[PDB]
Design a protein around this nucleic acid. Structure first.
Ligand SMILES: [Mg+2]
Ligand SMILES: [Mg+2]
Ligand SMILES: [Mg+2]
Ligand SMILES: [Mg+2]
Ligand SMILES: [Mg+2]
Ligand SMILES: [Mg+2]
Ligand SMILES: [Mg+2]
Ligand SMILES: [Mg+2]
Ligand SMILES: [Mg+2]
Ligand SMILES: [Mg+2]
Ligand SMILES: [Mg+2]
Ligand SMILES: [Mg+2]
Ligand SMILES: [Mg+2]
Ligand SMILES: [Mg+2]
Ligand SMILES: [Mg+2]
Ligand SMILES: [Mg+2]
Ligand SMILES: [Mg+2]
Ligand SMILES: [Mg+2]
Ligand SMILES: [Mg+2]
Ligand SMILES: [Mg+2]
Ligand SMILES: [Mg+2]
Ligand SMILES: [Mg+2]
Ligand SMILES: [Mg+2]
Ligand SMILES: [Mg+2]
Ligand SMILES: [Mg+2]
Ligand SMILES: [Mg+2]
Ligand SMILES: [Mg+2]
Ligand SMILES: [Mg+2]
Ligand SMILES: [Mg+2]
Ligand SMILES: [Mg+2]
Ligand SMILES: [Mg+2]
Ligand SMILES: [Mg+2]
Ligand SMILES: [Mg+2]
Ligand SMILES: [Mg+2]
Ligand SMILES: [Mg+2]
Ligand SMILES: [Mg+2]
Ligand SMILES: [Mg+2]
Ligand SMILES: [Mg+2]
Lengths: 64, 50, 79, 96
RNA sequence: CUUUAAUGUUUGAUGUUCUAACGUUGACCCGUAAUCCGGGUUGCGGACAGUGUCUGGUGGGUAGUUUGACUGGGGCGGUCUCCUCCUAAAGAGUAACGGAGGAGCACGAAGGUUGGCUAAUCCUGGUCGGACAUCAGGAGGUUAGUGCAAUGGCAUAAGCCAGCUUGACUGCGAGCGUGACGGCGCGAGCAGGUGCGAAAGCAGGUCAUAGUGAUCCGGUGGUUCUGAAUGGAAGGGCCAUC
RNA sequence: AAUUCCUUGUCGGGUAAGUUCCGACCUGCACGAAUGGCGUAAUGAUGGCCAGGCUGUCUCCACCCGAGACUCAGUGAAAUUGAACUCGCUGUGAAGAUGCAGUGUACCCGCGGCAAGACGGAAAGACCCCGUGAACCUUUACUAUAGCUUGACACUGAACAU
RNA sequence: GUUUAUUAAAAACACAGCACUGUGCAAACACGAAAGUGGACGUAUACGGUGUGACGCCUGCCCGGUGCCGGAAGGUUAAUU
RNA sequence: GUAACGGGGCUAAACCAUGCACCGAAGCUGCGGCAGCGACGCUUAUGCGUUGUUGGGUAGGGGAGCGUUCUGUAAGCCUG
RNA sequence: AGGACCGAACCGACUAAUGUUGAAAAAUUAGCGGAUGACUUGUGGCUGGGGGUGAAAGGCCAAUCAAACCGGGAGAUAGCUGGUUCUCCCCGAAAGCUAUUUAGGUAGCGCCUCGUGAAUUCAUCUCCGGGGGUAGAGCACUGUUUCGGCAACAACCCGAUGCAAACUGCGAAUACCGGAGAAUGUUAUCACGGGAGACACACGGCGGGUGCUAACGUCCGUC
RNA sequence: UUUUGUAUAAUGGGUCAGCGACUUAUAUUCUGUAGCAAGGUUAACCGAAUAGGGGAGCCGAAGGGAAACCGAGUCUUAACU
């Protein structure tokens, strides 16, 4: 039977030009009043997984 | 804690705002002190601080 | 008892010993707290908030000792 | 995804949603195609019947893929100033 | 037509009564030389009780489950995240229910800049001045002072005083350090705009290292990004934020 | 004390000698009045203690009569069992040796008998802990619910008064 | 008198006796989605539930907590409109 | 049960210093043979000569094979 | 008369021995209690499993009971234990860090194997460039100690003497980082990808915490 | 077999013969191999049934952006840095 993709992960990762998956950064939707405006600025631009967790997403997102 | 949170709205019609805290007790008056909101691309006064 | 606990890594130390390739702006010497364990000097300085010996324009590292009663001082000569 | 007991990764990183509902019908044609549409006028459809776009499709972009040679006329389709370029030269006309 | 009473309505209630639903485990008749059941008459009752749906309460009577880990067995006790020093063998890093302490904040100034300033302690002299307030001189030299632990650091002071102030700005960021990862940290320089200085210049918060909570689900404000026939809208996205 | 921890409490009785027993004291670790208090004739295959009688219970075993055991003929099991050419001591060793090292003793094989060892046979230890195991049980653990209850709308109608 | 058939016969259970409490009969209660039935062809000198356990002498003080019985003035409060 | 050199037994068969000899392993060498990889001497499906080197192995990875039943090749071939 | 008395039938089980691969999956023998009663027994009937029944032991409900027996869901689930079968050749681990309702499980990284790429990558040695506060030592500092001294018994101070994981006005060996160069090494090195296993380690040497500088003790670093 | 470690006095087997455990279906990804190649390949079905027809559709030659959209670029930002 056609493998079922991990619905969840498919809402946090986006396969790039190549393997790369492109993802959103954590710590940017809660308790920000007490956070470096530089930290958040360096948090807005979303940017892929680390090859160490990569093999844990291409097994979660079969049809990516 | 006690140090309540506070938001600094732009004096300009713009909706952009800043965020910080302040001791509601000790200092009664509300904080006003200017800043720079990207929208107007210009520095300006910022009010509202309990 | 009532004894235990302890901080963590906080590494802190020299990461650019002696003349190095010294990139456009390597680390050089973290050792936080240190304002005087190592001082800023020459074609490198910075001395960030956490007193991290910055290291400006790329090049060999020096590591000296001058005026104000000895004092370490880290500077970088160009290769 | 079960990374031991600790919270996973597809559960540790936020989720950025919102989906097309328009791209599924917004196609992308290529220079190689064009004249490949058998004859002139690269119409809104035709490409479809030319097994190169797909029924549901409602919109499409010319875009440069390579070929062009034979002068052609695209009808009812979008095009890049880098594609409308590589075509008018090799002969052609844009709908609009 | 606006402020105010009687009639009729409609309408809630309270209180009496009635009979006609409904009850009858009162009597009698018939099916039937049946205590069941049904139908009929009568009596008592009567819109009550009772049942259906909805709803508040009670509900170990019953049912499904949970009730942490480390631990010199387990339990009791203690501990669980973060910061400081030692153990840690002169780069980094390291264990124990090893030895010691701290944090879950504070500050619109205790932040920025500019101008200026420099302690503890003791000696001698001086009204009330007392071991020790304040004044004078000498000695002395980071033994003081850092908003709070400890360590490192501080005179070019990061210590202290005052003037003007909002750089505790916004968008980015060469290149690094540190992590298995999520992530955290340092950062010159660029663009737009600021403050202080005559100027070079400094400022993207506090001498630095603790002072914190991923995700989800939602809340608020902005935006013409999306908007299930079209226009809108609800909802969704993006940015800020709780 | 079916309650007393200290505890063989202290004193009296019983005995040559009494951590038990009986009678008292009261300092009740922590009795107490219907999850009854203190008594009580009778009853008890009920708990404790004492005496007479009795005795092989014992000092301390002896003899005897029978059923096995032993021999012969017939029939004819069992658990257990990696393989056996299956000795002692001292030491070594996964730490308690028939099997390793040293050494000692010993011709080959049965039969009756005894149980010190084969950590002998027997039950995947019930003790202990462990498993994000189970089941029954309890409650002011949670979350649900039968039942018991409340009101509302129905089945449910008519008059008069306030 | 009863009991752990197969390690416990007992001081345990039961018992006559005592008390509290429920129940007006279509009883309380109980079996049963219901009809119906047991209680009882009884009817408060009866029936259920609970604790105590012949008999003798007795059975003290505490209602704050929980439960149960009574009260309604007020506060809070569901569906509903 | 000697059982505090393994034993016998040793007055040097103990101990110290100096020196030569010998015993001693699956180590090193010698000879014969095997396979992975490299070099050169020939040789060019290359494949050999020499020659250098490598070949303890659990979890486990990799690479080569054997044998069994069945289908094609089986009207073939073997078989009283 | 009597839940009266002694005692057979009959009902029952208090003691002991023998039995325990039994004559028997609870009996035999010698004794023991009840024996007109809440007695005992024949035949048949009715209660059904979260249910019955119970003078109450969780006792009984067909040698079965803190939820019977049979069939079905059913190959429940088992991070646990066991078991896992022919041959030759090459390479060859780990018992660690981090997180974990995690601790005898698992995931990322580390370490193995196979493949594809890449450069004086990598390694040893010599030389050159670095930071070092450990060993040792010392006692100005921070504490701690002795003996003198000048001091209304004793502070400071001077001199002489020791001690320190959390003292340092000193300070190695050496380990580590970088640069240069020769030689040797079947690219040992790095990166990407296919396959893993392993996260119980033990002893011995060295530096240590803990313990008694006790343990075949325990916990780190390192070979 | 299990272990840091077993002659172990730790597990298992009295012996023999036969049987006894990494399969199967679909989806997906690598390696090897073959076909074709900026193209490759059909499914159900028709069927003259392993042919041939069927190109519905799937994968690839374009990506970036949440998206509208732009496109060898494109998001980010007022911004060419
Ligand atoms: Mg098509
Ligand atoms: Mg329960
Ligand atoms: Mg369940
Ligand atoms: Mg535990
Ligand atoms: Mg270090
Ligand atoms: Mg500070
Ligand atoms: Mg007495
Ligand atoms: Mg009592
Ligand atoms: Mg009383
Ligand atoms: Mg022995
Ligand atoms: Mg015997
Ligand atoms: Mg045994
Ligand atoms: Mg067991
Ligand atoms: Mg009796
Ligand atoms: Mg019994
Ligand atoms: Mg008995
Ligand atoms: Mg009683
Ligand atoms: Mg009593
Ligand atoms: Mg020789
Ligand atoms: Mg030899
Ligand atoms: Mg080998
Ligand atoms: Mg009698
Ligand atoms: Mg008998
Ligand atoms: Mg009798
Ligand atoms: Mg019968
Ligand atoms: Mg039975
Ligand atoms: Mg099932
Ligand atoms: Mg099974
Ligand atoms: Mg957790
Ligand atoms: Mg020392
Ligand atoms: Mg070191
Ligand atoms: Mg583990
Ligand atoms: Mg471990
Ligand atoms: Mg270890
Ligand atoms: Mg050990
Ligand atoms: Mg063991
Ligand atoms: Mg054995
Ligand atoms: Mg066999």
């Amino acid at each position: 039977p056609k493998i079922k993709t991990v619905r969840g992960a498919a809402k946090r990762f986006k396969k790039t030009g190549k393997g790369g998956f492109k993802h959103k950064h954590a710590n940017l939707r809660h308790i920000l009043t007490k956070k470096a405006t530089k930290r958040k600025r360096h948090l807005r631009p979303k940017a892929m997984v680390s090859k160490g967790d990569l093999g844990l997403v291409i097994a979660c997102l079969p049809y990516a | 804690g006690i140090r309540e949170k506070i938001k600094l709205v732009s004096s300009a019609g713009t909706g952009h705002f800043y965020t910080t805290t302040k001791n509601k007790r000790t200092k009664p008056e509300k904080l006003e002190l200017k800043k720079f909101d990207p929208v107007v691309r210009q520095h300006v006064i910022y009010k509202e601080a309990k | 008892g009532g004894s235990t606990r302890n901080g963590r890594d906080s590494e802190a130390k020299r990461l650019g010993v002696k003349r190095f390739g010294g990139e456009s702006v390597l680390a050089g010497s973290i050792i936080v707290r240190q304002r005087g364990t190592k001082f800023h000097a020459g074609a490198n300085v910075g001395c960030g908030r956490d007193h991290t010996l910055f290291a400006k324009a790329d090049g060999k590292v020096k590591f000296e000792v001058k005026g104000p009663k000895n004092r370490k001082f880290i500077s970088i000569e160009a290769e | 995804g079960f990374e031991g007991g600790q919270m996973p990764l597809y559960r540790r990183l936020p989720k950025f949603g919102f989906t097309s509902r328009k791209a599924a019908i917004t196609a992308e044609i290529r220079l190689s195609d064009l004249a490949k549409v058998e004859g002139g006028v690269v119409d809104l459809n035709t490409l479809k019947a030319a097994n190169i776009i797909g029924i549901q499709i409602e919109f499409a972009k010319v875009i440069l893929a390579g070929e062009v040679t034979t002068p052609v006329t695209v009808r009812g389709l979008r095009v890049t100033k880098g594609a409308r370029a590589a075509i008018e030269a090799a002969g052609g006309k844009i709908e609009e």
